Amino acid sequence: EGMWLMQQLGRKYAQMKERGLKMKEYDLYNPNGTSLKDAVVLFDGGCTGEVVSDRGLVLTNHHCGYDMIQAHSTLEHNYLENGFWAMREADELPNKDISVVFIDKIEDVTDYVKKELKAIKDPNSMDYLSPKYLQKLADKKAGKNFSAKNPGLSVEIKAFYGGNLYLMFTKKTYTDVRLVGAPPSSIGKFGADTDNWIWPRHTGDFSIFRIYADKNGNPAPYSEDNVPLKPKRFFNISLGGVQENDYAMIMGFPGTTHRYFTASEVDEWKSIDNDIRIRMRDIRQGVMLREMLADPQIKIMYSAKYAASQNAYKRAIGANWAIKTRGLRQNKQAMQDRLIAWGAKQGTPRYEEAVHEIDATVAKRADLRRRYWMIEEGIIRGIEFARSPIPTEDETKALQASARKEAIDKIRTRYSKFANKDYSAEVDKKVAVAMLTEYLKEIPYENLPLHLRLVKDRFAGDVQAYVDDIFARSVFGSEAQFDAFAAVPSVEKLAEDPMVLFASSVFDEYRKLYNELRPYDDPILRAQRTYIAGLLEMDGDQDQFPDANLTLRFTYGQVKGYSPRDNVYYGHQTTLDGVMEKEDPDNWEFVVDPKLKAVYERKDFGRYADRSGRMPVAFCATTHTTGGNSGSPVMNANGELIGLNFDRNWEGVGGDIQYLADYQRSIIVDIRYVLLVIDKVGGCQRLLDEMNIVP
Amino acid sequence: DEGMWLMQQLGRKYAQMKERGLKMKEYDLYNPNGTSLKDAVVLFDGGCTGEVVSDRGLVLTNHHCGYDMIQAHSTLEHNYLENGFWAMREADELPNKDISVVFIDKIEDVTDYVKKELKAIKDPNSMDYLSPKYLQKLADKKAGKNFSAKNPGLSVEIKAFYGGNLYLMFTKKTYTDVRLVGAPPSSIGKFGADTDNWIWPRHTGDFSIFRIYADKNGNPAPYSEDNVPLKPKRFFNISLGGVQENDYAMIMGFPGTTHRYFTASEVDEWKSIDNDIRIRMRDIRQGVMLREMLADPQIKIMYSAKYAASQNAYKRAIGANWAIKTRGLRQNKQAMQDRLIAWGAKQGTPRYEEAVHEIDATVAKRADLRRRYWMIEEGIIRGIEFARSPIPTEDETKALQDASARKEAIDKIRTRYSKFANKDYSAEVDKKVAVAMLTEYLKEIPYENLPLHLRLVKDRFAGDVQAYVDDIFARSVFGSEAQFDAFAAVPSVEKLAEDPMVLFASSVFDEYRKLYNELRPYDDPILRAQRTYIAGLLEMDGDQDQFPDANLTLRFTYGQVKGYSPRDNVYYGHQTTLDGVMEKEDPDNWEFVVDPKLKAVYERKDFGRYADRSGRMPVAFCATTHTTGGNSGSPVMNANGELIGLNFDRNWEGVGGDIQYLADYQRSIIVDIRYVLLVIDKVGGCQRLLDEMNIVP
Ligand SMILES: Cc1cccc(NC(=O)CN2CCOCC2)c1C
Ligand SMILES: Cc1cccc(NC(=O)CN2CCOCC2)c1C
Ligand SMILES: [Cl-]
Ligand SMILES: [Cl-]
Ligand SMILES: [Cl-]
């Protein structure tokens, strides 16, 4: 049920031991020594990774290393489709803009931060959550020139439990992290977007990197003279596999949770955030799908845009299913009622006052928040010509020196990025007509972006005519129309351009709504500091975990399937047989790598198959994970690596608000399948030889 | 493999059934010289099974089996299809026109008699051995002079089994006064609607209730207000003990057809011609229909039923092709025939190998013709609505060529035009479907094999299918109402003889009939060779573990209540519950609406004695019994012969079971009798039906 601070390991250790944990507490996390925690990294700012050899080899997901695999891919060597296996360390590919962060030390600095905060004065100050203010406190504690005296190291203070606990992290960052290995995309992304959030899952979602450093193992940017890092700790790889009910644990960097939402915040999340995103994306996706099915060229141009829209659409459907069926609102209501009754017993009304301030703020911002989600989902992300070019102040104060041609070259560049090889004005007009029809039905005239008032005023309510007119008369409506403008440019033409006026008007409204909504966050934040303080004082910092905030956490559970619906059971483990059942050669998402298909046919599973001769692929566990946990090491009762977390089932996406023991599962790629792919598909024996594989 | 056994085979199967859990005595289930549970089974309305559940002739069958009768009694004022129907007294039960229930009074092996009669052979290639007319002449000869008039209600029929190696005579008692007694609302009776057709898990309360009426002596009689409920020889006791995983279960019913003795070449043909063409052509037709239904709410109303009717056999063909690809159906038929050929070689009898060779040669010779037949049937006859547009008869063309018979011919043609261009017909949707179907058809069928009018696509329209279709509607008398009316005002045979739609429809029906007539002769050598093939199989491995193909006759099947794994890491259990109905509820989707009275029963847990030991309300279960079309409504029995459910469907994974039973995938989908009684009780409030049934603890 939780994403626990490393400091809470002492308090959780006895429960973990009763659940099957065999390793000593300080071998997992030691606050003043080397522990397994030292083999976990924050990979490229938003993923987790793990060190698996004494030469700095790192495992993470294929979707985590995707950008690096794509940046090194060419027509001649397409690593994204074919995979990549550096047969020697010198062949591993450097990556620009990459980092791996180690959590060297963690300290509780609550008393220090709370004493510093006493000098504020303004009771409503938000400095207690300000990265800038907390960095000034972190620098003060670390020392004037800490990073110079301890190179590669940096300090950071973060707030936890709504500002009731503060931790200082000493981080070691390495920026020379080289691509070592990756399976083909047919393995790394087998389900592709069709199996996203799905269990059972058959995806070999892994990629391999290596941390390089200077001669002393100290962080250093890319240099041909850099040498592989010899880390203080790395994971041993287990080949013992998993069985149903086995203890499993994860360490990683979960990004965000909303475990302390009031019942009113759950209602708002459902009725505004989720329902608007669901309704608007269903409209957008429906038009896009119609057009992609009718024209093979439209399918090529819009596949990625369609897939990008579907991901959070599916998340919102899953979250709304939890709200409707798992009593999330009711359980938050019971949590707050229990605190209110306990506060009334103690004579302290501040907790009830805090819940009331949150409810009142949620109620006051409802119409504004509805207008914001409506324009964001409906227009900002719904309509491509909303992101068409808007002449900057430097460009208009140049068209009316003769750098008129410089302004036109900059506007032309932006027009070519908007109307690129994947942009269809006809598809965009159809999407806009459906999205604007919905938007105009929901937003009244007095709340419309100024240009949209022309639908009623000038076009007699004809949305199609309004959209047709935008493209017919706009300098960005076609290449010929842009070129005619670029030959005789005038600021007058840009000032009256229907597409420019539309884009400007919708961005003006979007920014105005954002600016008006931003002040409502602060009273909720301040009231949450009092709310969570009461919850902790009443029930303890035992079963109530601090919200995720991109910091190192541990979670434990068991390898266990679940029943998704009446009379259906999904087991704890998928096999290579399941990959073969899903094979569809004329569907790019479900193509099977020929070398992998041959391994399955010959049963060339070596030491990686289970006791029954079946080749495992993935497993699921009752660990509590969220976005940020992609690539996290999954450990045995002995702390040996048994898999990598890569996804979570849609049924458990409501778990960011309320953990769902009977539905929520972490989706993990079995380490035996990772090794089978490195070995039989990649043929990269040197990677197997450098790992410490335990029988 | 698992079997749809003859009642005669119960004796030789009894010990295996007893070892599998059967507790009842053999003759209580079936006795040829007395009353048995077989006497409570009926063929309901010619194509379903039913069962007698009371000493007052009450009958249970599926809701989809009684659907037409529920619909015929439904009006705007009393919509029984939507709300259900529960006659609160026998006098309120609704009669039905054109209904029947058939009892199998006696079954007799007449093999020696038929085989002796057949020896009077004039032609060794004669098909009389399978002719309903010839076998009826033999049945009448054996039964006696004017049997029907001397035994009112009774009739005799002889059927061939095992490809003509076994013959049975059935003495049938038919009742035609069968009244509607009760039905749940369609939201329960067809809960899954077409979305859940062929699907397990299943949450459908697929049942309806009738009552057999007869004269004062319990003898068959057509509808009369003086008819009285039938007191039957036998009826089923209802069990409330329920089912558990691995429980013995058995069914009796009337499975229609199987192809258990197909050669490997017939499996290849079924896959590569029949199924692949139906799949490809229906995917094209359905795709266009769906795009049009999604774009226009009025097109969705007009085409929903046509779309659903196309999807049913499309899904069946996908499921059958999945079995051929993954369950080794071709290989197992090949092994069956190779084993017989090897045994025939040892016996010194080459006739079995010669018979399999004749079947392979006939299959190979008819391939191109059969491909052309399925291509035109799926692609045009079923695929394009204007293929079934009006064609003026020889008498209609004669009437139009000096009498008032002209206005009579035009009224007849108009009537047919109004049936073609009805409230559900869209010429625009039809032109779009035809353009896609004809494009595929023209790609597969060469010019010399085309229906004569389709040659105009290349010859007159320069390969433009859209222009050819546009021209058919632009110039045809049946292209629009105004075009028909202009023809009807000044009709001439000349105009009909040159009509592009008439010429298209005539041409495609001419080709369809020519292909059918040329293919029909190939059936006979296969049939004659199958008589020798199945005779060899029976002589070699015995009529013990090789069942006779289904032929709409009474059969029994046994197995266990058991789920299965459909794919890697997924298990479907043996039983669904009321909880599963509630998970599927979607008020804005007509297929998944939940009856308010039923939803309240679930909320209050008002399950009474119908819930399982854990307090869960069961809905449906699945079993390893071997069923097919014709088994809808069949009684499902306990080890004691008590009614535990009604069969209503089978999962798509087991549709290949008509050729080869699939022990790890094939399941009969059954509505739990506890759920039937829960609905009669808590939804219908029809206590008198519960009171007349013999319910055992
Ligand atoms: C939460 C959510 C919302 C909407 C759609 C999806 N995905 C699917 O339904 C598709 N997969 C693959 C093929 O169809 C069966 C399931 C999900 C996961
Ligand atoms: C063999 C075959 C072929 C094609 C489709 C189907 N059925 C479905 O997929 C329909 N529904 C969709 C969502 O609800 C569950 C099933 C089958 C059974
Ligand atoms: Cl290190
Ligand atoms: Cl012979
Ligand atoms: Cl099987």
Short mmCIF file of N, CA and C in Angstrom, two decimals, chain B residues 280-395:
data_model
loop_
_atom_site.label_atom_id
_atom_site.label_comp_id
_atom_site.label_asym_id
_atom_site.label_seq_id
_atom_site.Cartn_x
_atom_site.Cartn_y
_atom_site.Cartn_z
N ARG B 280 -13.16 -12.79 -45.61
CA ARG B 280 -12.71 -11.66 -46.41
C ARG B 280 -13.89 -10.80 -46.91
N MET B 281 -14.92 -11.44 -47.48
CA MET B 281 -16.05 -10.71 -48.03
C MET B 281 -16.88 -10.01 -46.97
N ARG B 282 -17.11 -10.66 -45.81
CA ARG B 282 -17.88 -10.02 -44.73
C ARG B 282 -17.11 -8.94 -44.04
N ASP B 283 -15.78 -9.04 -43.96
CA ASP B 283 -14.97 -7.97 -43.39
C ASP B 283 -15.10 -6.70 -44.27
N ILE B 284 -15.13 -6.88 -45.60
CA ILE B 284 -15.31 -5.73 -46.50
C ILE B 284 -16.70 -5.09 -46.33
N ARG B 285 -17.73 -5.91 -46.36
CA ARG B 285 -19.12 -5.48 -46.26
C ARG B 285 -19.40 -4.77 -44.93
N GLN B 286 -18.98 -5.39 -43.83
CA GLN B 286 -19.12 -4.90 -42.46
C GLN B 286 -18.35 -3.61 -42.25
N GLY B 287 -17.13 -3.51 -42.77
CA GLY B 287 -16.36 -2.28 -42.67
C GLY B 287 -17.07 -1.07 -43.28
N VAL B 288 -17.63 -1.24 -44.49
CA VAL B 288 -18.34 -0.12 -45.13
C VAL B 288 -19.60 0.22 -44.34
N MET B 289 -20.36 -0.82 -43.95
CA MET B 289 -21.59 -0.65 -43.18
C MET B 289 -21.34 0.09 -41.87
N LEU B 290 -20.29 -0.28 -41.13
CA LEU B 290 -19.91 0.33 -39.88
C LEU B 290 -19.56 1.81 -40.06
N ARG B 291 -18.73 2.15 -41.07
CA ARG B 291 -18.38 3.54 -41.35
C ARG B 291 -19.63 4.39 -41.59
N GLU B 292 -20.63 3.83 -42.32
CA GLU B 292 -21.86 4.56 -42.61
C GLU B 292 -22.78 4.67 -41.42
N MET B 293 -22.83 3.63 -40.57
CA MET B 293 -23.67 3.63 -39.38
C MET B 293 -23.11 4.60 -38.33
N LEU B 294 -21.77 4.67 -38.20
CA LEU B 294 -21.13 5.60 -37.25
C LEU B 294 -21.30 7.08 -37.67
N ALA B 295 -21.42 7.35 -38.96
CA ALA B 295 -21.55 8.70 -39.48
C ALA B 295 -22.98 9.25 -39.49
N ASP B 296 -23.99 8.36 -39.52
CA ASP B 296 -25.38 8.78 -39.60
C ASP B 296 -26.23 7.96 -38.65
N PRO B 297 -26.79 8.59 -37.60
CA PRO B 297 -27.62 7.84 -36.65
C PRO B 297 -28.83 7.14 -37.28
N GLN B 298 -29.34 7.69 -38.38
CA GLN B 298 -30.46 7.10 -39.08
C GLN B 298 -29.99 5.83 -39.84
N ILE B 299 -28.76 5.82 -40.37
CA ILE B 299 -28.19 4.65 -41.04
C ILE B 299 -27.94 3.52 -40.01
N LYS B 300 -27.55 3.88 -38.78
CA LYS B 300 -27.36 2.92 -37.71
C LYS B 300 -28.68 2.19 -37.39
N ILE B 301 -29.80 2.93 -37.37
CA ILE B 301 -31.10 2.33 -37.11
C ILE B 301 -31.48 1.38 -38.25
N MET B 302 -31.34 1.84 -39.49
CA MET B 302 -31.68 1.04 -40.66
C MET B 302 -30.80 -0.19 -40.88
N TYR B 303 -29.51 -0.13 -40.55
CA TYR B 303 -28.59 -1.22 -40.87
C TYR B 303 -28.12 -2.08 -39.69
N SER B 304 -28.54 -1.78 -38.44
CA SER B 304 -28.10 -2.55 -37.27
C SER B 304 -28.35 -4.04 -37.35
N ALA B 305 -29.54 -4.43 -37.73
CA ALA B 305 -29.91 -5.83 -37.82
C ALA B 305 -29.16 -6.52 -38.97
N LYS B 306 -29.04 -5.87 -40.16
CA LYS B 306 -28.28 -6.42 -41.28
C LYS B 306 -26.80 -6.60 -40.91
N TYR B 307 -26.25 -5.66 -40.17
CA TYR B 307 -24.86 -5.72 -39.72
C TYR B 307 -24.70 -6.87 -38.73
N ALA B 308 -25.59 -6.96 -37.72
CA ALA B 308 -25.55 -8.05 -36.72
C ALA B 308 -25.72 -9.44 -37.40
N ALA B 309 -26.64 -9.57 -38.36
CA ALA B 309 -26.86 -10.84 -39.07
C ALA B 309 -25.61 -11.27 -39.88
N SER B 310 -24.83 -10.32 -40.39
CA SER B 310 -23.63 -10.64 -41.16
C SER B 310 -22.52 -11.11 -40.22
N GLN B 311 -22.40 -10.46 -39.05
CA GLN B 311 -21.38 -10.73 -38.04
C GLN B 311 -21.46 -12.12 -37.40
N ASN B 312 -22.65 -12.68 -37.22
CA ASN B 312 -22.81 -13.97 -36.56
C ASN B 312 -21.99 -15.11 -37.20
N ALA B 313 -22.19 -15.40 -38.51
CA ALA B 313 -21.41 -16.45 -39.20
C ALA B 313 -19.98 -15.99 -39.50
N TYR B 314 -19.73 -14.68 -39.56
CA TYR B 314 -18.38 -14.12 -39.70
C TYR B 314 -17.56 -14.53 -38.46
N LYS B 315 -18.11 -14.30 -37.26
CA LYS B 315 -17.44 -14.69 -36.01
C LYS B 315 -17.23 -16.19 -35.94
N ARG B 316 -18.24 -16.98 -36.36
CA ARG B 316 -18.15 -18.44 -36.35
C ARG B 316 -16.99 -18.90 -37.25
N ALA B 317 -16.87 -18.30 -38.46
CA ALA B 317 -15.81 -18.63 -39.40
C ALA B 317 -14.42 -18.27 -38.85
N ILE B 318 -14.28 -17.13 -38.13
CA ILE B 318 -13.03 -16.74 -37.47
C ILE B 318 -12.68 -17.81 -36.40
N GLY B 319 -13.65 -18.18 -35.57
CA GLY B 319 -13.44 -19.19 -34.54
C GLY B 319 -13.05 -20.55 -35.11
N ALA B 320 -13.67 -20.95 -36.22
CA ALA B 320 -13.41 -22.26 -36.86
C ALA B 320 -12.01 -22.23 -37.47
N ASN B 321 -11.64 -21.12 -38.13
CA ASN B 321 -10.30 -20.98 -38.70
C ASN B 321 -9.22 -20.93 -37.61
N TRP B 322 -9.55 -20.42 -36.42
CA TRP B 322 -8.59 -20.41 -35.32
C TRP B 322 -8.31 -21.88 -34.91
N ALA B 323 -9.35 -22.73 -34.86
CA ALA B 323 -9.16 -24.14 -34.50
C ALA B 323 -8.31 -24.85 -35.56
N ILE B 324 -8.57 -24.58 -36.85
CA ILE B 324 -7.81 -25.22 -37.93
C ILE B 324 -6.33 -24.84 -37.84
N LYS B 325 -6.06 -23.57 -37.57
CA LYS B 325 -4.69 -23.06 -37.47
C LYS B 325 -3.95 -23.54 -36.23
N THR B 326 -4.64 -23.61 -35.08
CA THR B 326 -3.96 -23.89 -33.81
C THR B 326 -4.23 -25.24 -33.14
N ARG B 327 -5.30 -25.98 -33.51
CA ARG B 327 -5.63 -27.23 -32.82
C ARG B 327 -5.38 -28.52 -33.62
N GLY B 328 -4.73 -28.40 -34.75
CA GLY B 328 -4.38 -29.53 -35.59
C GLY B 328 -5.55 -30.31 -36.15
N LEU B 329 -6.61 -29.62 -36.65
CA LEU B 329 -7.78 -30.34 -37.15
C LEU B 329 -7.44 -31.09 -38.42
N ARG B 330 -6.68 -30.46 -39.31
CA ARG B 330 -6.31 -31.09 -40.57
C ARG B 330 -5.47 -32.33 -40.32
N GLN B 331 -4.48 -32.21 -39.43
CA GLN B 331 -3.56 -33.27 -39.07
C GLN B 331 -4.28 -34.45 -38.43
N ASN B 332 -5.24 -34.18 -37.55
CA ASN B 332 -5.98 -35.25 -36.90
C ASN B 332 -6.91 -35.98 -37.87
N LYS B 333 -7.45 -35.29 -38.89
CA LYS B 333 -8.25 -35.98 -39.91
C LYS B 333 -7.33 -36.83 -40.79
N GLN B 334 -6.13 -36.30 -41.11
CA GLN B 334 -5.11 -37.00 -41.89
C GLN B 334 -4.68 -38.28 -41.15
N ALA B 335 -4.46 -38.22 -39.83
CA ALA B 335 -4.07 -39.38 -39.03
C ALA B 335 -5.19 -40.43 -38.99
N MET B 336 -6.45 -39.98 -38.92
CA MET B 336 -7.61 -40.85 -38.88
C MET B 336 -7.70 -41.65 -40.18
N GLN B 337 -7.57 -40.97 -41.32
CA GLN B 337 -7.66 -41.65 -42.61
C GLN B 337 -6.43 -42.53 -42.89
N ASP B 338 -5.21 -42.10 -42.46
CA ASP B 338 -4.00 -42.90 -42.65
C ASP B 338 -4.05 -44.20 -41.87
N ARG B 339 -4.61 -44.15 -40.66
CA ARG B 339 -4.76 -45.31 -39.79
C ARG B 339 -5.74 -46.33 -40.43
N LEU B 340 -6.84 -45.84 -41.01
CA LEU B 340 -7.80 -46.72 -41.67
C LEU B 340 -7.18 -47.36 -42.92
N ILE B 341 -6.42 -46.57 -43.69
CA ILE B 341 -5.76 -47.03 -44.90
C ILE B 341 -4.74 -48.13 -44.58
N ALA B 342 -3.99 -47.96 -43.49
CA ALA B 342 -3.00 -48.95 -43.06
C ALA B 342 -3.69 -50.25 -42.60
N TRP B 343 -4.81 -50.12 -41.90
CA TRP B 343 -5.57 -51.27 -41.43
C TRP B 343 -6.25 -52.00 -42.59
N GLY B 344 -6.73 -51.25 -43.57
CA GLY B 344 -7.35 -51.80 -44.76
C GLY B 344 -6.35 -52.61 -45.56
N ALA B 345 -5.09 -52.15 -45.62
CA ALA B 345 -4.00 -52.84 -46.32
C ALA B 345 -3.72 -54.21 -45.66
N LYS B 346 -3.79 -54.28 -44.32
CA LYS B 346 -3.62 -55.52 -43.57
C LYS B 346 -4.80 -56.47 -43.76
N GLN B 347 -6.04 -55.95 -43.76
CA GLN B 347 -7.24 -56.78 -44.00
C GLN B 347 -7.31 -57.30 -45.46
N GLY B 348 -6.46 -56.80 -46.35
CA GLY B 348 -6.50 -57.14 -47.76
C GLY B 348 -7.67 -56.48 -48.49
N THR B 349 -8.21 -55.36 -47.94
CA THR B 349 -9.35 -54.65 -48.53
C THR B 349 -8.99 -53.24 -48.92
N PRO B 350 -8.76 -53.00 -50.21
CA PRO B 350 -8.38 -51.64 -50.64
C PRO B 350 -9.53 -50.65 -50.78
N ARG B 351 -10.78 -51.04 -50.49
CA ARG B 351 -11.92 -50.14 -50.69
C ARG B 351 -11.92 -48.86 -49.82
N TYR B 352 -11.29 -48.89 -48.64
CA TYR B 352 -11.25 -47.72 -47.75
C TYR B 352 -10.31 -46.66 -48.29
N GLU B 353 -9.15 -47.09 -48.79
CA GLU B 353 -8.16 -46.20 -49.39
C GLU B 353 -8.73 -45.61 -50.69
N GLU B 354 -9.44 -46.45 -51.47
CA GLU B 354 -10.09 -46.02 -52.71
C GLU B 354 -11.17 -44.97 -52.41
N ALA B 355 -11.91 -45.14 -51.29
CA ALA B 355 -12.94 -44.20 -50.88
C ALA B 355 -12.35 -42.83 -50.47
N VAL B 356 -11.26 -42.82 -49.70
CA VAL B 356 -10.59 -41.58 -49.29
C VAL B 356 -10.02 -40.88 -50.54
N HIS B 357 -9.45 -41.65 -51.47
CA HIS B 357 -8.94 -41.11 -52.73
C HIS B 357 -10.06 -40.49 -53.55
N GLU B 358 -11.27 -41.12 -53.63
CA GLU B 358 -12.38 -40.53 -54.37
C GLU B 358 -12.80 -39.20 -53.78
N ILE B 359 -12.80 -39.10 -52.43
CA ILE B 359 -13.15 -37.85 -51.76
C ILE B 359 -12.11 -36.76 -52.07
N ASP B 360 -10.81 -37.08 -51.95
CA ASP B 360 -9.73 -36.13 -52.26
C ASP B 360 -9.82 -35.66 -53.72
N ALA B 361 -10.05 -36.59 -54.65
CA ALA B 361 -10.13 -36.25 -56.07
C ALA B 361 -11.33 -35.37 -56.37
N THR B 362 -12.46 -35.64 -55.70
CA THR B 362 -13.66 -34.84 -55.93
C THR B 362 -13.44 -33.44 -55.37
N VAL B 363 -12.85 -33.34 -54.17
CA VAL B 363 -12.55 -32.04 -53.56
C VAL B 363 -11.61 -31.23 -54.47
N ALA B 364 -10.54 -31.88 -54.97
CA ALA B 364 -9.59 -31.19 -55.87
C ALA B 364 -10.25 -30.75 -57.18
N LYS B 365 -11.09 -31.60 -57.78
CA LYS B 365 -11.74 -31.26 -59.04
C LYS B 365 -12.73 -30.08 -58.95
N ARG B 366 -13.48 -29.96 -57.84
CA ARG B 366 -14.46 -28.88 -57.69
C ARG B 366 -13.93 -27.57 -57.14
N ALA B 367 -12.63 -27.49 -56.80
CA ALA B 367 -12.04 -26.29 -56.17
C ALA B 367 -12.36 -24.93 -56.84
N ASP B 368 -12.15 -24.80 -58.15
CA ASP B 368 -12.36 -23.53 -58.84
C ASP B 368 -13.82 -23.14 -58.86
N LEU B 369 -14.71 -24.11 -59.13
CA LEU B 369 -16.15 -23.90 -59.13
C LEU B 369 -16.63 -23.48 -57.73
N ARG B 370 -16.21 -24.22 -56.67
CA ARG B 370 -16.59 -23.91 -55.29
C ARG B 370 -16.10 -22.51 -54.87
N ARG B 371 -14.89 -22.14 -55.30
CA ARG B 371 -14.32 -20.81 -55.04
C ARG B 371 -15.19 -19.73 -55.73
N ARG B 372 -15.58 -19.97 -56.97
CA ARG B 372 -16.47 -19.05 -57.70
C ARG B 372 -17.85 -18.93 -57.05
N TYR B 373 -18.35 -20.03 -56.50
CA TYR B 373 -19.65 -20.06 -55.85
C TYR B 373 -19.65 -19.24 -54.55
N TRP B 374 -18.67 -19.49 -53.67
CA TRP B 374 -18.55 -18.74 -52.43
C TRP B 374 -18.25 -17.25 -52.70
N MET B 375 -17.46 -16.97 -53.72
CA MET B 375 -17.13 -15.60 -54.09
C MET B 375 -18.39 -14.82 -54.50
N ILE B 376 -19.25 -15.40 -55.34
CA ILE B 376 -20.49 -14.73 -55.74
C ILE B 376 -21.54 -14.73 -54.63
N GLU B 377 -21.62 -15.81 -53.83
CA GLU B 377 -22.60 -15.87 -52.74
C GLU B 377 -22.29 -14.86 -51.64
N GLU B 378 -21.06 -14.82 -51.17
CA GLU B 378 -20.64 -13.89 -50.13
C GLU B 378 -20.47 -12.48 -50.65
N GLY B 379 -19.88 -12.35 -51.82
CA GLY B 379 -19.60 -11.07 -52.43
C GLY B 379 -20.78 -10.32 -53.01
N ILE B 380 -21.73 -11.03 -53.65
CA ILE B 380 -22.85 -10.37 -54.33
C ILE B 380 -24.22 -10.77 -53.81
N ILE B 381 -24.54 -12.10 -53.80
CA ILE B 381 -25.86 -12.58 -53.39
C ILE B 381 -26.22 -12.09 -51.98
N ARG B 382 -25.30 -12.25 -51.01
CA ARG B 382 -25.48 -11.75 -49.64
C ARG B 382 -24.86 -10.34 -49.51
N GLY B 383 -23.77 -10.08 -50.22
CA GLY B 383 -23.03 -8.83 -50.07
C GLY B 383 -23.68 -7.56 -50.55
N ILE B 384 -24.43 -7.62 -51.68
CA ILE B 384 -25.01 -6.42 -52.29
C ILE B 384 -26.53 -6.47 -52.32
N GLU B 385 -27.20 -5.53 -51.66
CA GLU B 385 -28.67 -5.52 -51.59
C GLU B 385 -29.38 -5.40 -52.94
N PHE B 386 -28.81 -4.63 -53.89
CA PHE B 386 -29.48 -4.52 -55.20
C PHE B 386 -29.34 -5.79 -56.04
N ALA B 387 -28.60 -6.82 -55.58
CA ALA B 387 -28.61 -8.12 -56.25
C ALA B 387 -30.03 -8.73 -56.05
N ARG B 388 -30.69 -8.47 -54.90
CA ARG B 388 -32.04 -8.96 -54.65
C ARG B 388 -33.12 -7.92 -54.98
N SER B 389 -32.86 -7.08 -55.98
CA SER B 389 -33.83 -6.12 -56.47
C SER B 389 -34.83 -6.90 -57.38
N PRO B 390 -35.99 -6.31 -57.76
CA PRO B 390 -36.96 -7.05 -58.57
C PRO B 390 -36.54 -7.47 -59.98
N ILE B 391 -36.85 -8.73 -60.31
CA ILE B 391 -36.64 -9.28 -61.64
C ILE B 391 -38.03 -9.65 -62.17
N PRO B 392 -38.48 -9.00 -63.26
CA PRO B 392 -39.82 -9.32 -63.80
C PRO B 392 -39.94 -10.78 -64.22
N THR B 393 -40.95 -11.48 -63.71
CA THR B 393 -41.16 -12.90 -64.03
C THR B 393 -41.52 -13.10 -65.53
N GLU B 394 -41.53 -14.37 -66.02
CA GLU B 394 -41.92 -14.64 -67.42
C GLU B 394 -43.39 -14.22 -67.64
N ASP B 395 -44.26 -14.46 -66.63
CA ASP B 395 -45.67 -14.10 -66.63
C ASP B 395 -45.87 -12.58 -66.51
#
